[PDB]
Amino acid sequence: SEAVIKVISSACKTYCGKTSPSKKEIGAMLSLLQKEGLLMSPSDLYSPGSWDPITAALSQRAMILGKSGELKTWGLVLGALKAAREE
Numbered sequence: 001s002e003a004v005i006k007v008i009s010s011a012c013k014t015y016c017g018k019t020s021p022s023k024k025e026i027g028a029m030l031s032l033l034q035k036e037g038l039l040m041s042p043s044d045l046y047s048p049g050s051w052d053p054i055t056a057a058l059s060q061r062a063m064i065l066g067k068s069g070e071l072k073t074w075g076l077v078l079g080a081l082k083a084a085r086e087e
Contacts, residue, residue: 004042015080029073048085
């Protein structure tokens with residue numbers, strides 16, 4: 001909502017680098033992860049046990065609707081966290 005955008009922006013930069021997303025990207029993806037009912041708060045990203053219902057949905061709408069405007073962001077924000085919760 002304001003902090004998470006940065007709390008995760010620093011992680012993706014250390015797990016991806018320049019390839020990482022942007023404050024504009026994540027910010028938009030978040031609003032979508034809250035409207036779809038997939039998340040109740042921006043801090044929900046700290047729940048690695050909810051990435052399942054959040055990864056299948058995004059990949060489902062993209063494969064079906066034909067647009068991964070939010071997937072490209074999820075995959076990135078995930079590729080970083082997944083590594084942060086492994087060490």
